[PDB]
Design an enzyme around this catalytic site. Structure first.
Site, PDB file in Angstrom:
ATOM      1  N   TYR A   1      48.311 -49.309  58.189  1.00 43.27           N
ATOM      2  CA  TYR A   1      49.579 -49.199  57.814  1.00 43.27           C
ATOM      3  C   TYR A   1      50.689 -50.960  58.699  1.00 43.27           C
ATOM      4  CZ  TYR A   1      49.166 -44.242  56.212  1.00 43.27           C
ATOM      5  OH  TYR A   1      48.502 -43.056  55.630  1.00 43.27           O
TER       6      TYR A   1
ATOM      7  N   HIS B   1      46.067 -49.812  53.706  1.00 37.97           N
ATOM      8  CA  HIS B   1      47.526 -48.950  52.990  1.00 37.97           C
ATOM      9  C   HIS B   1      48.675 -50.251  52.686  1.00 37.97           C
ATOM     10  CE1 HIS B   1      44.562 -45.731  52.968  1.00 37.97           C
ATOM     11  NE2 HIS B   1      45.340 -44.996  54.077  1.00 37.97           N
TER      12      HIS B   1
ATOM     13  N   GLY C   1      47.480 -39.285  59.833  1.00 34.40           N
ATOM     14  CA  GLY C   1      46.380 -38.738  59.369  1.00 34.40           C
ATOM     15  C   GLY C   1      45.294 -39.980  59.883  1.00 34.40           C
TER      16      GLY C   1
HETATM   17  C1  FAD Z   1      47.717 -32.872  50.948  1.00 29.81           C
HETATM   18  C2  FAD Z   1      48.043 -34.340  52.329  1.00 29.81           C
HETATM   19  C3  FAD Z   1      47.905 -35.365  51.815  1.00 29.81           C
HETATM   20  C4  FAD Z   1      47.773 -36.107  53.361  1.00 29.81           C
HETATM   21  N1  FAD Z   1      48.307 -37.300  52.572  1.00 29.81           N
HETATM   22  C5  FAD Z   1      48.385 -38.712  53.524  1.00 29.81           C
HETATM   23  C6  FAD Z   1      48.125 -39.609  53.396  1.00 29.81           C
HETATM   24  O1  FAD Z   1      48.766 -39.567  52.644  1.00 29.81           O
HETATM   25  N2  FAD Z   1      48.206 -39.913  54.772  1.00 29.81           N
HETATM   26  C7  FAD Z   1      47.847 -39.947  56.163  1.00 29.81           C
HETATM   27  O2  FAD Z   1      47.501 -40.582  56.695  1.00 29.81           O
HETATM   28  N3  FAD Z   1      47.659 -38.998  56.313  1.00 29.81           N
HETATM   29  C8  FAD Z   1      47.642 -37.726  55.596  1.00 29.81           C
HETATM   30  N4  FAD Z   1      47.383 -36.281  55.074  1.00 29.81           N
HETATM   31  C9  FAD Z   1      47.210 -36.150  57.018  1.00 29.81           C
HETATM   32  C10 FAD Z   1      48.040 -35.751  57.202  1.00 29.81           C
HETATM   33  O3  FAD Z   1      49.797 -36.429  57.378  1.00 29.81           O
HETATM   34  C11 FAD Z   1      47.870 -35.360  58.436  1.00 29.81           C
HETATM   35  O4  FAD Z   1      47.320 -34.069  58.722  1.00 29.81           O
HETATM   36  C12 FAD Z   1      49.116 -34.564  59.531  1.00 29.81           C
HETATM   37  O5  FAD Z   1      50.100 -35.433  59.740  1.00 29.81           O
HETATM   38  C13 FAD Z   1      48.800 -34.019  60.807  1.00 29.81           C
HETATM   39  O6  FAD Z   1      50.018 -33.127  61.016  1.00 29.81           O
HETATM   40  P1  FAD Z   1      49.725 -31.953  61.402  1.00 29.81           P
HETATM   41  O7  FAD Z   1      51.151 -31.344  62.088  1.00 29.81           O
HETATM   42  O8  FAD Z   1      49.712 -31.096  60.322  1.00 29.81           O
HETATM   43  O9  FAD Z   1      48.765 -32.115  62.551  1.00 29.81           O
HETATM   44  P2  FAD Z   1      47.506 -30.465  63.331  1.00 29.81           P
HETATM   45  O10 FAD Z   1      45.954 -30.997  63.273  1.00 29.81           O
HETATM   46  O11 FAD Z   1      48.306 -28.985  63.601  1.00 29.81           O
HETATM   47  O12 FAD Z   1      48.400 -30.458  64.919  1.00 29.81           O
HETATM   48  C14 FAD Z   1      47.294 -32.083  65.692  1.00 29.81           C
HETATM   49  C15 FAD Z   1      46.714 -32.077  67.157  1.00 29.81           C
HETATM   50  O13 FAD Z   1      47.709 -30.978  68.088  1.00 29.81           O
HETATM   51  C16 FAD Z   1      47.377 -30.582  68.765  1.00 29.81           C
HETATM   52  N5  FAD Z   1      48.781 -29.142  69.378  1.00 29.81           N
HETATM   53  C17 FAD Z   1      49.693 -28.286  68.685  1.00 29.81           C
HETATM   54  N6  FAD Z   1      50.447 -27.971  69.103  1.00 29.81           N
HETATM   55  C18 FAD Z   1      50.761 -29.103  70.095  1.00 29.81           C
HETATM   56  C19 FAD Z   1      51.305 -28.816  72.032  1.00 29.81           C
HETATM   57  N7  FAD Z   1      52.281 -27.898  71.513  1.00 29.81           N
HETATM   58  N8  FAD Z   1      51.301 -29.925  72.388  1.00 29.81           N
HETATM   59  C20 FAD Z   1      50.094 -30.225  72.336  1.00 29.81           C
HETATM   60  N9  FAD Z   1      49.589 -30.606  70.874  1.00 29.81           N
HETATM   61  C21 FAD Z   1      49.456 -30.173  70.217  1.00 29.81           C
HETATM   62  C22 FAD Z   1      46.495 -28.749  67.519  1.00 29.81           C
HETATM   63  O14 FAD Z   1      46.151 -27.688  67.725  1.00 29.81           O
HETATM   64  C23 FAD Z   1      45.772 -30.102  67.274  1.00 29.81           C
HETATM   65  O15 FAD Z   1      45.145 -30.582  68.031  1.00 29.81           O
HETATM   66  C24 FAD Z   1      47.476 -35.632  54.685  1.00 29.81           C
HETATM   67  C25 FAD Z   1      47.330 -34.222  54.404  1.00 29.81           C
HETATM   68  C26 FAD Z   1      47.504 -33.318  53.640  1.00 29.81           C
HETATM   69  C27 FAD Z   1      47.410 -31.837  53.636  1.00 29.81           C
END
Ligand code: FAD
Ligand code: FAD
EC number: 1.6.5.2
Lengths: 272, 274
Positions: B156, B162, B150
């Site tokens: 980083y 971080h 995220g």
């Molecule tokens: C418990 C928890 C702890 C976390 N800790 C950290 C942390 O320590 N450090 C940090 O930096 N982050 C942290 N995060 C955030 C986390 O890393 C991000 O939420 C995650 O990496 C996002 O990836 P995703 O696949 O879920 O994204 P999504 O939101 O599911 O996808 C991102 C985007 O891509 C789009 N997309 C999907 N499919 C396609 C496709 N085929 N082509 C193009 N676009 C597409 C989606 O629709 C959206 O717009 C944490 C999250 C949680 C829940």
């Protein structure tokens, strides 16, 4: 009239981890602490984040995003009650002790999941309130860890490498990120080759430490004030601070080593 | 690389996620170059991530003083491990390349993937005290982490709030993967995916696919070889005296974990050197 929460991540009541928890409870009560427990195995705690953590109505069930949904649910009060019960224990607690065995160079899965389900945005951190400005800045945390390997294996010259690097993601990235003051970890090495009599002394030392735990000086992390805390600056270290640090031999911390030498036992010993 | 087998481990609940898109891109690219591809989609499998007594289906050696490491090992040798574990072990045995696709969660792997390591990487199968690091059982296999975050890359960097990403990856890449013998390749790091515009997201997938076409030829990351150490209990698994003497004059350490009190070689855990 202070409150301690003890989080335990071991399945067996016969374990030294369980003994350490019991020792901690006893020592703290004797000094007049209220003590609450989250024994995660005994509770059958669910460590997996999922849609079921929100009992109300999803903002967007077609494109489900746990960070956004969990935060809304926290604000509007429709988080699964198992989560909320844990959140309330945290809110009340002044001191949080995490007792666990080192497993694959980190926390057990069940404890990792507790962090994932319980440390929700707005409750435990915001974009604006990170690190030393975090919500738990009035609270203190300590890790109490057991390993199978010996201390030498995790020394600077040991096969596994510096223990300080192993602890950093947990102590900086989880605890200090939410504001906790982090105390020196209790490290119990090579527990599997330690006879009963020695184990008893170790518990006695643990109990003795806990009598004055609240007075101890915490570990050093770089203050947030060294950084430009906004999206445009990229959360980089301020230029003026970079200029002041250029000529020093040592970095600030394990994570903020700045390409230089890491201060000795940054994550194991407080500077005092 | 035809004839070769890949295992892809995914740790994300949502088919609509970018993590899922990355997995699909990887499967497609590898099949097109003639790889056999197997998946462990941990959420789709409802994988149980919690170690317990129920992982042993036979008879405990000592039910009164239960110790998972000893019992799990016996069960592996005598063939009474829970079959969900064994099925995962068989996928690993067969695989040449393992890709782990997951979001960074609290500076590491999701709990469900952490549990997969705890239940699947059993003593004797995945490591012994005699066969550690570069002498480990999986020394013929290659592994790569593909991580989404995220937060932005600046957070980083060495000067980010971080701290160095190299330190965050070390416990995983050294402590889990290399410990069992894996050659570890450069991680695929995809920062601030939620604030990436669509057209960039598409390029990222395309770049991932392009990389996977030659993944087998890549140089792995550097870890200190086991041969630098006295591997026995009396020496304490310390670095040999002669190697200490040879390193005394150098400005840089060997690795993130083996920094030796000196400077950490740049991007030790992010970039390979040749
Ligand atoms: C418990 C928890 C702890 C976390 N800790 C950290 C942390 O320590 N450090 C940090 O930096 N982050 C942290 N995060 C955030 C986390 O890393 C991000 O939420 C995650 O990496 C996002 O990836 P995703 O696949 O879920 O994204 P999504 O939101 O599911 O996808 C991102 C985007 O891509 C789009 N997309 C999907 N499919 C396609 C496709 N085929 N082509 C193009 N676009 C597409 C989606 O629709 C959206 O717009 C944490 C999250 C949680 C829940
Ligand atoms: C999946 C997994 C991964 C692991 N990864 C790592 C790793 O990366 N690094 C590493 O170093 N180790 C690792 N280990 C080993 C692990 O850290 C150790 O097994 C753990 O530290 C053992 O402590 P315990 O509490 O389980 O003690 P046990 O071995 O369960 O108990 C020790 C003994 O103390 C006795 N005892 C209990 N209470 C008392 C008392 N009051 N007085 C006296 N004796 C008492 C018990 O009866 C028993 O005989 C791993 C283990 C597992 C299962």
């Amino acid at each position: 009239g202070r409150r301690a929460l003890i989080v335990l991540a071991h399945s067996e009541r016969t374990s030294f981890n369980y003994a350490m928890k019991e020792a901690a409870a006893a020592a703290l009560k004797k000094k007049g602490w209220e003590v609450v427990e989250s024994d995660l195995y005994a509770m059958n705690f669910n460590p997996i984040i999922s849609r079921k953590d929100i009992t109300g109505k999803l903002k967007d069930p077609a494109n489900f995003q746990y960070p956004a949904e969990s935060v809304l649910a926290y604000k509007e009060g429709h988080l699964s009650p198992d989560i909320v019960a844990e959140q309330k224990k945290l809110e009340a607690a002044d001191l949080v002790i995490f007792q666990f065995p080192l497993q694959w160079f980190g926390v057990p899965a069940i404890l990792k999941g507790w962090f994932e389900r319980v440390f929700i945005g707005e409750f435990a951190y915001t974009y604006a309130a990170m690190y030393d400005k975090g919500p738990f800045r009035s609270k203190k945390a300590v890790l109490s860890i057991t390993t199978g390997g010996s201390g030498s294996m995790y020394s600077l010259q040991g096969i596994h490498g510096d223990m300080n690097v192993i602890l950093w993601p947990i102590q900086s990235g989880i605890l200090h990120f939410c504001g906790f003051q982090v105390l020196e970890p209790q490290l119990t090495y090579s527990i599997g080759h330690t006879p009963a009599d020695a184990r008893i002394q170790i518990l006695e030392g643990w109990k003795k430490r806990l009598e004055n735990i609240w007075d101890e000086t915490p570990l050093y992390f770089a203050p947030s004030s060294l950084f430009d805390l906004n999206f445009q600056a990229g959360f980089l270290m301020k230029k003026e601070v970079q200029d002041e640090e250029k000529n020093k031999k040592f970095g600030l911390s394990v994570g903020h080593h700045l390409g230089k030498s890491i201060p000795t036992d940054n994550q194991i010993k407080a500077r005092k």
